[PDB]
Amino acid sequence: RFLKVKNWETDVVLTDTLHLKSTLETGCTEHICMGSIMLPTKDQLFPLAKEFLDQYYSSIKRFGSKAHMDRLEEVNKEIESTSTYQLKDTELIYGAKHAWRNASRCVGRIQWSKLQVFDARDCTTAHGMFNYICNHVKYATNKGNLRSAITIFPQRTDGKHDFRVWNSQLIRYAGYKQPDGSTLGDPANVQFTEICIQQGWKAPRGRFDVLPLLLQANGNDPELFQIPPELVLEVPIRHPKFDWFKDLGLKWYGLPAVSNMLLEIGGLEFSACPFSGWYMGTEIGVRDYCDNSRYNILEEVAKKMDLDMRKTSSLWKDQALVEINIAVLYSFQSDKVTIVDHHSATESFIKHMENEYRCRGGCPADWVWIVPPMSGSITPVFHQEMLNYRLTPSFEYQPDPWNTHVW
Amino acid sequence: RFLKVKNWETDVVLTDTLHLKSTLETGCTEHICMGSIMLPVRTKDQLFPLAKEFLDQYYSSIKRFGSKAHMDRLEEVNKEIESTSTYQLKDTELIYGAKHAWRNASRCVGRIQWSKLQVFDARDCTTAHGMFNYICNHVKYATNKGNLRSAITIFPQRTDGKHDFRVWNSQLIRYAGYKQPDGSTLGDPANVQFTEICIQQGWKAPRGRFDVLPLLLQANGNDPELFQIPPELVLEVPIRHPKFDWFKDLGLKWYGLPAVSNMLLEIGGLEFSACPFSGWYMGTEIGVRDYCDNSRYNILEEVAKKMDLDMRKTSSLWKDQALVEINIAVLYSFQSDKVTIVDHHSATESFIKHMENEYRCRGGCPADWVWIVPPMSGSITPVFHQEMLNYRLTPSFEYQPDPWNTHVWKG
Numbered sequence: 025r026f027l028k029v030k031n032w033e034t035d036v037v038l039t040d041t042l043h044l045k046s047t048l049e050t051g052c053t054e055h056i057c058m059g060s061i062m063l064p065t066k067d068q069l070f071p072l073a074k075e076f077l078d079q080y081y082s083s084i085k086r087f088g089s090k091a092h093m094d095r096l097e098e099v100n101k102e103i104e105s106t107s108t109y110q111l112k113d114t115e116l117i118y119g120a121k122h123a124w125r126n127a128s129r130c131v132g133r134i135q136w137s138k139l140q141v142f143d144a145r146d147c148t149t150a151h152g153m154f155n156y157i158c159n160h161v162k163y164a165t166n167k168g169n170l171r172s173a174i175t176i177f178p179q180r181t182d183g184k185h186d187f188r189v190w191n192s193q194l195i196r197y198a199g200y201k202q203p204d205g206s207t208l209g210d211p212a213n214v215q216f217t218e219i220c221i222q223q224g225w226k227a228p229r230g231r232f233d234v235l236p237l238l239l240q241a242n243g244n245d246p247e248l249f250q251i252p253p254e255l256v257l258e259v260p261i262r263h264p265k266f267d268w269f270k271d272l273g274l275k276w277y278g279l280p281a282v283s284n285m286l287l288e289i290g291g292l293e294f295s296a297c298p299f300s301g302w303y304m305g306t307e308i309g310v311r312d313y314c315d316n317s318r319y320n321i322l323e324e325v326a327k328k329m330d331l332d333m334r335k336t337s338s339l340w341k342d343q344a345l346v347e348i349n350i351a352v353l354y355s356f357q358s359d360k361v362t363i364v365d366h367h368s369a370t371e372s373f374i375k376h377m378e379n380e381y382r383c384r385g386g387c388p389a390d391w392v393w394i395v396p397p398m399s400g401s402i403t404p405v406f407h408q409e410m411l412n413y414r415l416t417p418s419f420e421y422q423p424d425p426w427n428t429h430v431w
Numbered sequence: 432r433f434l435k436v437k438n439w440e441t442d443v444v445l446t447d448t449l450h451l452k453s454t455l456e457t458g459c460t461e462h463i464c465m466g467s468i469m470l471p472v473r474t475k476d477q478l479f480p481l482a483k484e485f486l487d488q489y490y491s492s493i494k495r496f497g498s499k500a501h502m503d504r505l506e507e508v509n510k511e512i513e514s515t516s517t518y519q520l521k522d523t524e525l526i527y528g529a530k531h532a533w534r535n536a537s538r539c540v541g542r543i544q545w546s547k548l549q550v551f552d553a554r555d556c557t558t559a560h561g562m563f564n565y566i567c568n569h570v571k572y573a574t575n576k577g578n579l580r581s582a583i584t585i586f587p588q589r590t591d592g593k594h595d596f597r598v599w600n601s602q603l604i605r606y607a608g609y610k611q612p613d614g615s616t617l618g619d620p621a622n623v624q625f626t627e628i629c630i631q632q633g634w635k636a637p638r639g640r641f642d643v644l645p646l647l648l649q650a651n652g653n654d655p656e657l658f659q660i661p662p663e664l665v666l667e668v669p670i671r672h673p674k675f676d677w678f679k680d681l682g683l684k685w686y687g688l689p690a691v692s693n694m695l696l697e698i699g700g701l702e703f704s705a706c707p708f709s710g711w712y713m714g715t716e717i718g719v720r721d722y723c724d725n726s727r728y729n730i731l732e733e734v735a736k737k738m739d740l741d742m743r744k745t746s747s748l749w750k751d752q753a754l755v756e757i758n759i760a761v762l763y764s765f766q767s768d769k770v771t772i773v774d775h776h777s778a779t780e781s782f783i784k785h786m787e788n789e790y791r792c793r794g795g796c797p798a799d800w801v802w803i804v805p806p807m808s809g810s811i812t813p814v815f816h817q818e819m820l821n822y823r824l825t826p827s828f829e830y831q832p833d834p835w836n837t838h839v840w841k842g
């Protein structure tokens with residue numbers, strides 16, 4: 025009930041109390057740990073609303089004030105009448121910031137309080153959504169000096185009137201299968217790519233074709249929009265010592281911006297809530313480029329480096345992996361687009377944990393996700409015990425819209 | 432109830448039913464996951480269920496479940512418990528037990544090898560000089576001049592908890608740690624405390640950077656005694672790099688035989704508190720953890736100086752570069768000297784095949800992702816992409832408190 029976590033590299037020990045305020049369930053039992061699985065009414069709403077407003081009014085130091093009780097009754101009347109309610113702007117900003125704060129898989133929550141919240145609850149059409157999204161991209165990109173932001177569309181109602189961005193991120197590259205047999209472009213996006221082609225997109229069929237946005241307002245069929253190319257900031261990938269690196273032809277976009285998650289605040293569901301911050305270097309260098317089912321380029325890079333590829337024990341995969349990642353970092357820095365390296369990001373996150381343990385009484389953290397996908401044990405997060413638990417407000421996964429939507 | 436796990440790189444889906452035979456507790460609840468937490472006499476009452484359950488397992492695996500010989504063994508253990516309070520394992524059931532404990536070890540990436548385990552029975556042993564002899568034979572047999580063989584030696588089980596056999600060292604072979612008065616460390620930082628116990632107990636410390644610690648051995652609950660392993664029995668490998676000629680001048684070496692001596696083997700309710708087992712090393716255990724943790728030899732800086740990397744910003748990835756070079760160096764030294772070692776690409780790929788085989792034949796494979804994934808190059812090894820179900824089966828290996836915090840001194 026009072027829990028201790030230990031850093032085995034420094035012997036720092038923190039006590040967790042925050043976990044007792046956990047609501048949702050983990051997947052785990054006393055019999056089976058599931059910590060490595062990727063995805064494990066009027067009556068219903070009022071509790072959820074009350075829990076949220078209680079923490080809201082406590083955070084501004086008005087717990088048990090008139091204004092607190094009064095809001096609680098006003099929302100109570102709203103629900104009992106309309107079977108739903110609206111968040112105030114202030115509560116919306118707080119809900120959003122805290123959803124990020126409670127994101128146990130997010131290594132960059134040291135930034136949680138500097139989030140620009142754009143309220144788009146007045147939106148009615150895909151065109152409207154396209155407009156908010158472009159202002160979001162422009163704002164967050166900031167000519168390379170990236171800034172955290174989320175844009176929030178209208179909340180779920182009956183459930184047939186949902187706003188969704190079909191894309192997984194605002195900015196991704198297309199995926200094409202070939203007669204040849206293999207995949208041109210990002211193999212991760214082949215299915216979405218055909219939904220765009222099958223919706224009307226004329227695909228340039230290149231390796232790095234930015235995808236069009238597929239936007240759905242009010243449960244309607246989604247519509248295509250190309251993001252003004254002048255708004256998509258991209259970085260050519262070169263190496264600070266390998267002259268031939270640039271001839272591999274690699275580029276990546278500067279703005280990571282997740283668009284397929286569902287934001288839950290005080291029982292209310294915001295099914296379109298694209299958010300953006302900036303990249304940890306390994307996300308691109310390790311995962312996007314080197315995953316066997318992504319751009320999968322290790323084999324081709326190791327060749328240029330002329331390493332011994334006849335035996336795994338030469339560690340050629342590892343040698344090539346480092347250089348690829350050196351080059352991502354170097355490129356972004358040289359072009360002055362915000363990026364963070366895994367050493368810096370994890371060091372930051374440990375400082376954040378230490379703040380949250382003393383400010384809040386804990387920090388939910390998912391070790392499987394927090395530890396970078398390269399050089400794990402030489403970053404401090406590796407040695408840090410973490411407690412994973414689910415707090416609200418939260419971001420949550422949700423079914424791909426194309427499995428659900430009806431035409 | 433059935434449970435699927437998915438590999439995200441191959442989309443292979445596997446179904447687990449084995450977890451249904453799980454009895455021990457995970458540390459997690461429906462409300463909290465403790466997956467990255469480092470650490471997780473019996474009455475007659477608690478004892479016979481544990482015995483019966485273990486011997487049903489044994490007799491099924493030999494296709495004799497329900498047999499005359501299975502029943503007679505049940506009744507015999509039944510009566511032996513209820514009269515002598517405990518019972519003794521047959522050799523075959525001890526062999527089978529020790530192999531299963533390894534097979535059920537969810538944090539072990541090496542389990543493709545589980546069925547190949549030399550078991551030495553030292554349950555007739557009575558004294559520390561007796562333990563020393565058993566341990567020497569084990570070290571000699573497992574070393575096999577560099578062609579490492581897995582083995583475990585099993586000393587008498589716990590009885591009243593007052594007459595415990597323990598090996599006080601955490602591994603049979605390991606380097607001294609010496610805290611200096613300026614606050615720096617000589618040798619290996621993780622062994623400072625154990626090293627001081629040795630000094631106190633009579634050990635004359637050579638006080639170098641790679642001094643093999645003596646064995647500290649407790650028999651039958653008596654005070655531990657000191658024994659030096661014959662150096663001819665201690666295979667060591669000097670560390671060099673195939674292309675870096677200055678690498679040898681760093682003065683590193685490591686031992687070839689990893690042999691864990693502080694765990695408790697539990698079989699059918701019985702507690703074997705001294706049970707050293709040994710295999711061989713995955714390269715990253717030495718190159719990443721032993722040499723590059725901040726709390727161990729910590730050579731990253733010195734290697735990075737020698738490679739003349741940019742060290743002013745972490746974003747140069749100078750740490751990551753040095754770490755790869757050290758790791759190539761470790762694998763290179765061992766292979767050149769014909770000492771068995773396995774790299775982490777090869778070990779994790781073997782583990783994935785083993786885990787699939789285990790889902791087919793056994794209905795599952797408990798596995799701990801936090802431990803299975805190597806401490807370098809995580810996502811380019813296929814285990815990173817493998818969802819895994821962690822749960823506890825017996826027989827099993829378990830942690831136990833260090834003996835110096837529990838031992839009652841006689842004088």
Ligand code: HEM
Pocket residue numbers: 124127129130131132133135139172173174299300301302303304307364369393419
């Ligand atoms: C400031 C820049 C940021 C950095 C460097 C950062 C870092 C990361 C990284 C590396 C991951 C794992 C991604 C993956 O492996 O797929 C992640 C997960 C997450 N982040 Fe952050 N983040 C940042 C800003 C934010 C913001 C502004 C939000 C929300 C407002 C956020 C919410 C999340 C969520 C919900 C996840 C987990 C998604 C999932 O479960 O699949 N991130 N973050």
Ligand code: HEM
Pocket residue numbers: 529533536538539540541542544548581582583708709710711712713716773778802828
């Ligand atoms: C054949 C050579 C072997 C290799 C390459 C291998 C590999 C490993 C590695 C790399 C670890 C993680 C250790 C750490 O990070 O400290 C481990 C854990 C483990 N292995 Fe294996 N292993 C092998 C043989 C065995 C044998 C013969 C047994 C028992 C008979 C065994 C039982 C375990 C147990 C109980 C753990 C967990 C340690 C803990 O919880 O602290 N290993 N093994």
Ligand SMILES: N=C(Nc1cccc(CCNCc2cccc(NC(=N)c3cccs3)c2)c1)c1cccs1
Pocket residue numbers: 212280281282299300301302303304307315317318439440816
């Ligand atoms: N299907 C796959 N992976 C898969 C399947 C489902 C979900 C996810 C998680 C990816 N999430 C995108 C994401 C989410 C949150 C943060 C980021 N990264 C960022 N830096 C930010 C995005 C927005 C603000 S910061 C990326 C990955 C695989 C392909 C190849 C091997 S596995």
Ligand SMILES: N=C(Nc1cccc(CCNCc2cccc(NC(=N)c3cccs3)c2)c1)c1cccs1
Pocket residue numbers: 032033469541621689690691708709710711712713716724726
């Ligand atoms: N006390 C520490 N760590 C710690 C605390 C508790 C347990 C363990 C795990 C150490 N295990 C050693 C081990 C265990 C099992 C297998 C191996 N490796 C092998 N290849 C084999 C050994 C024997 C057969 S195979 C090593 C590590 C720390 C010191 C500095 C920072 S953390």
Ligand SMILES: C[C@H](O)[C@H](O)[C@H]1CNc2nc(N)[nH]c(=O)c2N1
Pocket residue numbers: 059060061062392393394439815816817818819
């Ligand atoms: C199966 C396993 O849970 C899966 O590979 C996870 C591991 N850790 C991860 N960590 C991060 N940050 N992102 C990921 O996509 C994953 N994938």
Ligand SMILES: C[C@H](O)[C@H](O)[C@H]1CNc2nc(N)[nH]c(=O)c2N1
Pocket residue numbers: 032406407408409410466467468469801802803
């Ligand atoms: C806190 C965390 O659980 C701890 O550092 C673990 C992480 N994973 C590990 N994995 C292995 N194989 N060995 C270890 O010592 C550790 N340490």
Ligand SMILES: [Zn+2]
Pocket residue numbers: 052053056057058059459463464465466
């Ligand atoms: Zn768990």
